[PDB]
Design a protein around this ligand. Structure first.
Ligand SMILES: O=C(CCC1CCCC1)N1CCNCC1
Ligand SMILES: O=C(CCC1CCCC1)N1CCNCC1
Length: 330
């Protein structure tokens, strides 16, 4: 089997991408944030505290003929941005792009933090990191990808995010029309449960490539590119007037600037992030200070190749017995 679904930016900045997901019988379609950096599938629901719902579409398990309470199971997640959600668990039929999993754990939120309430476009998350990070207790649950894997034509999914445009998530096949040149594969450690790999270095604009090992996670759930402070300083030093602002919480730059590209290594291959991808616009409406799309990972504990980096590539998440990542230019 295979599946193919379009993923769409939630706003003009590509702050997050949503993908339609069918849950239950008859189908209830929710727009979920696919997250290669976490391993829970959780939704706004008929159980979510009413004051914490503001415009999201909710899953109502009592309207699904295939929904079953997973008796005794609860979940609770705390994200790095300080947001959180928690609740109970149903099993139900879940389909993504025509690929159907029966018996998927659907984590129904009873509580969500303010960042989730305030984002009316995101009805929940769908996790695609390894199932070892799933938060369901007392019986950990599998991700949609892990449940689908045995049925798939190939044990892979691919992320092809757009810059200010829709893109695609495919399951079970590699669309050889969706990239240019060849795919470079690189090793993945599952030791922390993330898709964790090691970039071979970087360049800023037309500068020389610096060979240096950079360990991080391929995370579709993350908007920006988080790298070591040395690398980030080297990038922003090439932008007149850029500075790190403790008031704003990262690097900002004059909205009049033209940003240089950023290149990251994948083995002997190179992925080039165009400068425009690194512009996240005014810090507040009407400001002439703009927020940078490359930020320091100092205080995170890990480098994050988020959407700014991933959207410059066709990315293969190879879930074979020995997992690997693949990157191609596009
Ligand atoms: O990119 C982030 C936060 C990144 C943080 C960096 C360190 C911990 C996580 N998003 C995506 C859009 N929704 C809000 C959260
Ligand atoms: O903060 C995290 C990890 C969340 C935890 C990992 C396992 C349990 C939840 N991020 C940054 C945003 N994208 C997802 C990865």
């Amino acid at each position: 089997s295979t599946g193919s679904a379009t993923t769409t930016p939630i706003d003009s900045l590509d702050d997050a991408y949503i993908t339609p997901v069918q849950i239950g019988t008859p189908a209830q379609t929710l727009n979920l944030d696919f997250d290669t950096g976490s391993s829970d599938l959780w939704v706004f629901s008929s159980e979510t505290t009413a004051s914490e719902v503001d415009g999201q579409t909710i899953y109502t398990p009592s309207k699904s003929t295939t929904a079953k309470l997973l008796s005794g199971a609860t979940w609770s997640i705390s994200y790095g941005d300080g947001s959180s959600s928690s609740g109970d668990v149903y099993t139900d039929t879940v389909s993504v792009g025509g690929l159907t999993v029966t018996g998927q754990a659907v984590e129904s939120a009873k509580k969500v933090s303010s960042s989730f309430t305030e984002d009316s476009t995101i009805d929940g998350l769908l996790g695609l990191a390894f199932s070892t990070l799933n938060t369901v207790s007392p019986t950990q649950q599998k991700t949609f990808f892990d449940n689908a894997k045995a049925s798939l034509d190939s044990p892979v999914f691919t992320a092809d995010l757009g810059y200010h445009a829709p893109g695609t998530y495919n399951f079970g096949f590699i669309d050889t029309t969706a990239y240019t040149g060849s795919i470079t594969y690189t090793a993945v450690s599952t030791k922390q449960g993330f898709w964790e790999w090691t970039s071979t270095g970087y360049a800023v604009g037309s500068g020389t490539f610096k060979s240096t090992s950079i360990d991080g996670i391929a995370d579709t759930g993350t908007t920006l590119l988080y790298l070591p402070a040395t690398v980030v300083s080297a990038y922003w030093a090439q932008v007149s007037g850029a500075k790190s602002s403790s008031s704003v919480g990262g690097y900002v730059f004059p909205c009049s600037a033209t940003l240089p590209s950023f290149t990251f290594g994948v083995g002997s291959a190179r992925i080039v992030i165009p400068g425009d991808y690194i512009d996240f616009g005014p810090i507040s409406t009407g400001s002439s200070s703009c927020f940078g799309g490359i930020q320091s990972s100092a205080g995170i504990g890990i480098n994050i190749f988020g959407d700014v980096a991933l959207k410059a590539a066709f990315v293969v998440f190879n879930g074979a017995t020995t997992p690997t990542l693949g990157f191609a230019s596009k």
